[PDB]
Amino acid sequence: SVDLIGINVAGAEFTGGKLPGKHGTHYFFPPEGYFEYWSEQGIHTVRFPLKWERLQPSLNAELDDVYASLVDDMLDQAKENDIKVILDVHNYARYRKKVIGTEDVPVSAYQDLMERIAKRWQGHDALFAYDIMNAPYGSADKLWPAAAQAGIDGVRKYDKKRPLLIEGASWSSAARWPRYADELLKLKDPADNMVFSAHVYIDEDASGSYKKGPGKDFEPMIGVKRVEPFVNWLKEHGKKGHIGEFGIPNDDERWLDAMDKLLAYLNENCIPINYWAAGPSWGNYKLSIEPKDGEKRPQVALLKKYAAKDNCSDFGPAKAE
Ligand SMILES: OC[C@H]1O[C@@H](O[C@H]2[C@H](O)[C@@H](O)[C@H](O[C@H]3[C@H](O)[C@@H](O)[C@H](O)O[C@@H]3CO)O[C@@H]2CO)[C@H](O)[C@@H](O)[C@@H]1O
């Protein structure tokens, strides 16, 4: 089933310059007991970033045994705790810093990754969906629609059922979505089960850096205003949508006000959200909602408030009848 309220659980993609890196030093999967907390809080959908270069250290080669087995174990813990998991290839449409579709990283190698991901995990009950690439940007933008088709073809070799979450150019900006997304209308899914997934941060430059506070002329509808181009594009083209990332600092009511207005608009349109982010090794990261001694997490109350208002049976927005 489709939960409107979900969270990112980040950590497996950390310290991306250390490849392969060492689990528990450079990157972090959920420990035992991790999902039990969020399950108890009423959050039952998790988006889970993975680093492509760790899953597949050589293009077209078998998946890495150590890192892929950590994914196996996370999915097991998810299933044990009634957690639905969106696997996220958290790679900005690049492999070892080279754009998918260049000579260095042919689209067939990206198709290969997605085939092996689907082949390994389509049988797993905790797997909910594939977010096939996180936040394409920059020099990857123009090649990304062709890359996405290869990723879709890859998953569909082995998983004919589950939703594919398709992000957009420009860090999958919700605010700029229709500037680029017409290129995604060419994508073909044989299973006809794609969901487009945009991201939204509400600091001025939408980077999620939150270097400054809200500012005196802060607009509390800024979150709604920044997802409206995305949701309206979905309505215009009869598509289904999703917000894969949104996060705010914990230290100004204006941020929380904008978050509440955002969740209201997403609820009205049956658009799920994955809050960015929870995770086992965030420290004092300003957007973290992971419990931390002495750190307040007002955002989690808003998530629970809207988890209880979730009356949707499928990804929105609704089509006209
Ligand atoms: O850094 C790790 C996280 O990055 C998130 O992406 C952000 C990029 O890091 C940031 O460079 C980019 O900033 C853009 C901004 O989006 C755009 O509006 C402005 O015009 O230009 C900026 C670059 O100068 O923002 C994105 C967020 O929108 C990933 O989303 C996250 O997955 C990853 O963990």
mmCIF file of C-alpha atoms in Angstrom, residues 135-320:
data_model
loop_
_atom_site.group_PDB
_atom_site.id
_atom_site.type_symbol
_atom_site.label_atom_id
_atom_site.label_comp_id
_atom_site.label_asym_id
_atom_site.label_seq_id
_atom_site.Cartn_x
_atom_site.Cartn_y
_atom_site.Cartn_z
ATOM 1 C CA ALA A 135 19.133 13.908 -8.251
ATOM 2 C CA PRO A 136 20.664 14.056 -11.728
ATOM 3 C CA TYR A 137 22.224 17.480 -12.170
ATOM 4 C CA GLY A 138 24.536 19.623 -14.232
ATOM 5 C CA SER A 139 26.422 17.873 -17.008
ATOM 6 C CA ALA A 140 24.194 14.819 -16.464
ATOM 7 C CA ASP A 141 20.888 16.631 -17.103
ATOM 8 C CA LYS A 142 20.737 16.301 -20.873
ATOM 9 C CA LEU A 143 21.716 12.611 -20.978
ATOM 10 C CA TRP A 144 19.509 11.659 -18.042
ATOM 11 C CA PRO A 145 16.213 10.911 -19.899
ATOM 12 C CA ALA A 146 18.063 8.402 -22.098
ATOM 13 C CA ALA A 147 19.761 6.955 -19.024
ATOM 14 C CA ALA A 148 16.407 6.650 -17.245
ATOM 15 C CA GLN A 149 14.985 4.576 -20.085
ATOM 16 C CA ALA A 150 17.926 2.193 -19.712
ATOM 17 C CA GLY A 151 17.322 1.967 -15.970
ATOM 18 C CA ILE A 152 13.619 1.266 -16.490
ATOM 19 C CA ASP A 153 14.455 -1.436 -19.038
ATOM 20 C CA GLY A 154 16.905 -2.928 -16.557
ATOM 21 C CA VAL A 155 14.483 -3.185 -13.646
ATOM 22 C CA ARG A 156 11.712 -4.505 -15.857
ATOM 23 C CA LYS A 157 13.797 -7.472 -16.986
ATOM 24 C CA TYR A 158 13.198 -8.986 -13.523
ATOM 25 C CA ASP A 159 10.507 -6.928 -11.751
ATOM 26 C CA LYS A 160 7.324 -6.404 -13.771
ATOM 27 C CA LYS A 161 5.207 -5.159 -10.852
ATOM 28 C CA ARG A 162 6.771 -2.572 -8.576
ATOM 29 C CA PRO A 163 6.658 1.213 -9.097
ATOM 30 C CA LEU A 164 9.674 2.907 -10.614
ATOM 31 C CA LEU A 165 10.419 6.304 -9.113
ATOM 32 C CA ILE A 166 11.765 8.554 -11.863
ATOM 33 C CA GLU A 167 13.567 11.716 -10.815
ATOM 34 C CA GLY A 168 14.218 14.761 -12.953
ATOM 35 C CA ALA A 169 17.073 16.973 -14.067
ATOM 36 C CA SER A 170 18.430 19.818 -11.968
ATOM 37 C CA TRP A 171 18.637 17.822 -8.704
ATOM 38 C CA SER A 172 15.044 16.678 -9.392
ATOM 39 C CA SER A 173 13.878 20.183 -8.478
ATOM 40 C CA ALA A 174 10.140 20.279 -7.930
ATOM 41 C CA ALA A 175 10.199 24.058 -8.433
ATOM 42 C CA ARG A 176 11.873 23.849 -11.849
ATOM 43 C CA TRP A 177 10.301 20.521 -12.816
ATOM 44 C CA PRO A 178 8.331 21.560 -15.937
ATOM 45 C CA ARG A 179 11.394 23.369 -17.363
ATOM 46 C CA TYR A 180 12.973 19.975 -18.094
ATOM 47 C CA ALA A 181 10.437 17.233 -17.497
ATOM 48 C CA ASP A 182 8.850 17.206 -20.962
ATOM 49 C CA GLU A 183 11.856 15.049 -21.932
ATOM 50 C CA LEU A 184 10.609 12.422 -19.461
ATOM 51 C CA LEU A 185 7.274 12.095 -21.246
ATOM 52 C CA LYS A 186 9.113 9.978 -23.834
ATOM 53 C CA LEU A 187 9.892 7.294 -21.234
ATOM 54 C CA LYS A 188 8.158 3.958 -21.817
ATOM 55 C CA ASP A 189 7.501 1.489 -19.011
ATOM 56 C CA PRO A 190 6.120 -1.881 -20.205
ATOM 57 C CA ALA A 191 4.466 -2.309 -16.813
ATOM 58 C CA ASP A 192 3.042 1.236 -17.017
ATOM 59 C CA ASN A 193 3.945 1.863 -13.390
ATOM 60 C CA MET A 194 6.218 4.908 -13.210
ATOM 61 C CA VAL A 195 5.952 7.570 -10.526
ATOM 62 C CA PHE A 196 7.834 10.822 -10.902
ATOM 63 C CA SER A 197 9.724 11.935 -7.815
ATOM 64 C CA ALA A 198 10.781 15.522 -7.207
ATOM 65 C CA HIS A 199 12.710 17.091 -4.354
ATOM 66 C CA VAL A 200 12.057 20.307 -2.473
ATOM 67 C CA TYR A 201 14.081 22.297 0.034
ATOM 68 C CA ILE A 202 12.903 25.687 1.161
ATOM 69 C CA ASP A 203 16.026 27.676 1.816
ATOM 70 C CA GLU A 204 16.419 30.491 -0.711
ATOM 71 C CA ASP A 205 18.541 28.549 -3.210
ATOM 72 C CA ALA A 206 16.631 25.263 -2.555
ATOM 73 C CA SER A 207 19.924 23.494 -1.819
ATOM 74 C CA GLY A 208 18.862 22.290 1.606
ATOM 75 C CA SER A 209 22.013 23.878 3.023
ATOM 76 C CA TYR A 210 19.986 26.263 5.222
ATOM 77 C CA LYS A 211 23.055 28.434 5.688
ATOM 78 C CA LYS A 212 20.864 31.306 6.904
ATOM 79 C CA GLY A 213 17.593 31.545 8.758
ATOM 80 C CA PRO A 214 14.253 32.135 7.045
ATOM 81 C CA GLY A 215 14.698 35.848 6.556
ATOM 82 C CA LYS A 216 12.264 38.652 7.255
ATOM 83 C CA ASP A 217 10.295 38.337 3.996
ATOM 84 C CA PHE A 218 9.886 34.580 4.462
ATOM 85 C CA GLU A 219 6.851 33.191 2.654
ATOM 86 C CA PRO A 220 5.248 30.292 4.596
ATOM 87 C CA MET A 221 3.717 28.954 1.374
ATOM 88 C CA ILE A 222 7.182 28.598 -0.206
ATOM 89 C CA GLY A 223 7.049 24.795 0.043
ATOM 90 C CA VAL A 224 3.640 24.670 -1.629
ATOM 91 C CA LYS A 225 4.743 27.210 -4.236
ATOM 92 C CA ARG A 226 7.811 25.110 -5.027
ATOM 93 C CA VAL A 227 5.928 21.833 -5.481
ATOM 94 C CA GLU A 228 3.035 23.410 -7.426
ATOM 95 C CA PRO A 229 4.967 23.387 -10.759
ATOM 96 C CA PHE A 230 5.584 19.671 -10.230
ATOM 97 C CA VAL A 231 2.062 18.740 -9.136
ATOM 98 C CA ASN A 232 0.523 20.818 -11.915
ATOM 99 C CA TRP A 233 2.749 19.120 -14.472
ATOM 100 C CA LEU A 234 1.573 15.751 -13.129
ATOM 101 C CA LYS A 235 -2.038 16.875 -13.525
ATOM 102 C CA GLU A 236 -1.400 18.329 -17.000
ATOM 103 C CA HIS A 237 0.135 15.057 -18.234
ATOM 104 C CA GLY A 238 -1.926 12.518 -16.287
ATOM 105 C CA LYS A 239 1.105 11.306 -14.320
ATOM 106 C CA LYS A 240 1.646 10.138 -10.740
ATOM 107 C CA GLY A 241 4.011 11.896 -8.371
ATOM 108 C CA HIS A 242 6.087 11.644 -5.237
ATOM 109 C CA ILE A 243 8.381 13.904 -3.185
ATOM 110 C CA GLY A 244 11.555 11.930 -2.470
ATOM 111 C CA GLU A 245 13.331 14.577 -0.372
ATOM 112 C CA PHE A 246 12.265 17.447 1.839
ATOM 113 C CA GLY A 247 13.914 18.576 5.052
ATOM 114 C CA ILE A 248 14.085 21.609 7.319
ATOM 115 C CA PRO A 249 16.126 22.784 10.304
ATOM 116 C CA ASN A 250 14.585 22.374 13.737
ATOM 117 C CA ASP A 251 15.144 25.922 14.976
ATOM 118 C CA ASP A 252 12.582 28.322 13.517
ATOM 119 C CA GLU A 253 8.792 28.196 13.583
ATOM 120 C CA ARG A 254 8.689 29.623 10.072
ATOM 121 C CA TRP A 255 10.252 26.426 8.679
ATOM 122 C CA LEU A 256 7.699 24.258 10.495
ATOM 123 C CA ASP A 257 4.840 26.444 9.269
ATOM 124 C CA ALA A 258 6.021 25.958 5.678
ATOM 125 C CA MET A 259 6.368 22.207 6.291
ATOM 126 C CA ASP A 260 2.816 21.959 7.588
ATOM 127 C CA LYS A 261 1.479 23.875 4.593
ATOM 128 C CA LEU A 262 3.488 21.599 2.295
ATOM 129 C CA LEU A 263 2.166 18.389 3.846
ATOM 130 C CA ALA A 264 -1.371 19.746 3.584
ATOM 131 C CA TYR A 265 -0.981 20.339 -0.154
ATOM 132 C CA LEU A 266 0.635 16.944 -0.710
ATOM 133 C CA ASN A 267 -2.141 15.266 1.268
ATOM 134 C CA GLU A 268 -4.799 17.013 -0.846
ATOM 135 C CA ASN A 269 -3.098 15.554 -3.935
ATOM 136 C CA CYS A 270 -2.165 12.098 -2.568
ATOM 137 C CA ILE A 271 1.528 12.859 -3.151
ATOM 138 C CA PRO A 272 3.743 10.846 -0.759
ATOM 139 C CA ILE A 273 6.762 12.423 0.852
ATOM 140 C CA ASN A 274 10.043 11.034 2.139
ATOM 141 C CA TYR A 275 11.452 13.355 4.777
ATOM 142 C CA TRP A 276 15.189 14.046 4.461
ATOM 143 C CA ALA A 277 16.439 12.556 6.635
ATOM 144 C CA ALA A 278 16.667 9.994 9.394
ATOM 145 C CA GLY A 279 19.533 7.585 9.645
ATOM 146 C CA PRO A 280 21.940 5.918 12.042
ATOM 147 C CA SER A 281 24.992 8.211 11.708
ATOM 148 C CA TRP A 282 23.890 11.817 11.230
ATOM 149 C CA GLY A 283 25.341 13.430 14.356
ATOM 150 C CA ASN A 284 24.333 17.080 14.662
ATOM 151 C CA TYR A 285 23.262 17.346 11.003
ATOM 152 C CA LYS A 286 20.770 20.173 10.951
ATOM 153 C CA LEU A 287 18.011 18.361 9.023
ATOM 154 C CA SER A 288 18.226 15.050 10.908
ATOM 155 C CA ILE A 289 15.083 13.653 12.498
ATOM 156 C CA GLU A 290 16.994 10.743 14.012
ATOM 157 C CA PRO A 291 16.598 10.828 17.816
ATOM 158 C CA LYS A 292 19.583 12.452 19.488
ATOM 159 C CA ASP A 293 19.931 13.274 23.200
ATOM 160 C CA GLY A 294 19.054 16.911 23.759
ATOM 161 C CA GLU A 295 18.031 17.530 20.137
ATOM 162 C CA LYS A 296 14.429 18.518 19.485
ATOM 163 C CA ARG A 297 12.689 17.091 16.394
ATOM 164 C CA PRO A 298 9.525 19.158 15.873
ATOM 165 C CA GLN A 299 9.346 17.867 12.269
ATOM 166 C CA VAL A 300 8.418 14.347 13.391
ATOM 167 C CA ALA A 301 5.226 15.607 15.042
ATOM 168 C CA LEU A 302 4.111 17.107 11.717
ATOM 169 C CA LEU A 303 4.880 13.829 9.952
ATOM 170 C CA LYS A 304 2.783 11.877 12.455
ATOM 171 C CA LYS A 305 -0.021 14.445 12.244
ATOM 172 C CA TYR A 306 -0.237 13.882 8.513
ATOM 173 C CA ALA A 307 0.369 10.131 8.726
ATOM 174 C CA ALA A 308 -2.938 9.959 10.619
ATOM 175 C CA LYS A 309 -4.685 12.069 7.944
ATOM 176 C CA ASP A 310 -3.523 9.769 5.113
ATOM 177 C CA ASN A 311 -6.687 8.646 3.273
ATOM 178 C CA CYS A 312 -5.072 7.829 -0.090
ATOM 179 C CA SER A 313 -5.041 4.424 -1.785
ATOM 180 C CA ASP A 314 -2.549 5.238 -4.560
ATOM 181 C CA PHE A 315 -0.088 7.845 -5.793
ATOM 182 C CA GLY A 316 -1.831 11.024 -6.812
ATOM 183 C CA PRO A 317 -2.747 13.405 -8.154
ATOM 184 C CA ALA A 318 -6.241 12.226 -9.133
ATOM 185 C CA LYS A 319 -7.143 12.309 -12.817
ATOM 186 C CA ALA A 320 -10.190 14.207 -14.054
#
